[PDB]
Amino acid sequence: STQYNFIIDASAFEKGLGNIKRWCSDCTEAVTLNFYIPTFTLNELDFLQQRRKSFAARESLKFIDRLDDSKFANLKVFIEFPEVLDIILWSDVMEHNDSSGKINIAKLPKRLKNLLKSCIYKCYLEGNEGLHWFLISEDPQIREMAMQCNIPSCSIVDVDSILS
Numbered sequence: 001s002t003q004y005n006f007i008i009d010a011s012a013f014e015k016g017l018g019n020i021k022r023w024c025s026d027c028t029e030a031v032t033l034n035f036y037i038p039t040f041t042l043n044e045l046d047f048l049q050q051r052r053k054s055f056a057a058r059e060s061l062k063f064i065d066r067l068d069d070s071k072f073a074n075l076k077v078f079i080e081f082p083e084v085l086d087i088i089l090w091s092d093v094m095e096h097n098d099s100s101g102k103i104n105i106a107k108l109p110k111r112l113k114n115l116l117k118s119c120i121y122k123c124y125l126e127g128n129e130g131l132h133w134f135l136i137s138e139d140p141q142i143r144e145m146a147m148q149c150n151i152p153s154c155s156i157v158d159v160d161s162i163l164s
Contacts, residue, residue, distance in 0.1 A: 003032045004162070005131045007122055009115065010044035011138035013060035016156035021063065023163060024075055031163065032074040034131070037064060038118035039082045040111060080118060088117040088125065093149060096120055101148035112145065119151040 013020065027033045042064070048057035067077040093116050097105050105116070119135055121127040135146050135153040146153045154162075 001030060001032070003034055003131070004159075005034045005036070005122075005133045006159075007036045007038060007119055007133055007135045008041060009038075009135065009137040009139065009142055010041045010048065010057070010060075011142065012136040012156060013041065013045060013064075014048060014054060014056045015138040017056050017060050017063065019156045019160060023159070024067070024072055026163075027074040029074060032076070034076045035067070036078050036080065036118075036122055036127070036133070038080045038115060039085060040115035040118060042079070043111065084121060084127075085114050085117055088121050090117070092125060093117055093120045096124060096149045096151075098148050098150070103145055103148050105145065105148065108145065112142070115142065116145065116149055116151075119146060120149065123151055 008020070023033060042061070045054075045057045045061050045064075048054040049061060064077075064079070067075070068079055090113070093113075094105070105113075108116070119133075122133045133152075135142075135151050136156070136159060137143050137146070137153055138156060143153045143155075
């Protein structure tokens with residue numbers, strides 16, 4: 001039996017909602033899925049739905065509500081408690097940052113710093129639970145900052161190849 005543990009960003013939902021729904025309905029006793037939805041994702045999908053009139057972002061938020069309300073077979077979903085961001089230390093993110101990396105992590109906008117806090121919390125800190133986590137994203141800036149902080153990431157196509 002295997003379990004995949006994913007942290008899913010907003011761009012993954014906006015660009016790959018149809019793919020994610022298929023993973024959720026095709027998972028079996030042999031392959032179970034375990035999702036963590038950070039505060040970044042909820043806030044960014046709300047921004048996309050309101051400010052960009054994104055149909056896919058609006059549908060993604062409704063799908064996340066369905067996931068959190070209903071108990072799907074072989075699927076676990078956890079929505080981040082926003083107060084966790086005030087407990088996670090920025091110094092714990094900096095301890096995983098490659099200092100030779102070209103991105104100035106300390107100068108990123110607050111919403112991206114908090115996405116990094118959520119990822120580090122799962123990959124390395126109290127949110128780990130003895131599991132191996134991957135970040136799913138369709139945003140190059142996010143994948144590049146995640147790689148500099150040793151957070152493994154995958155595109156929608158990467159996951160589709162691992163699950164097929």
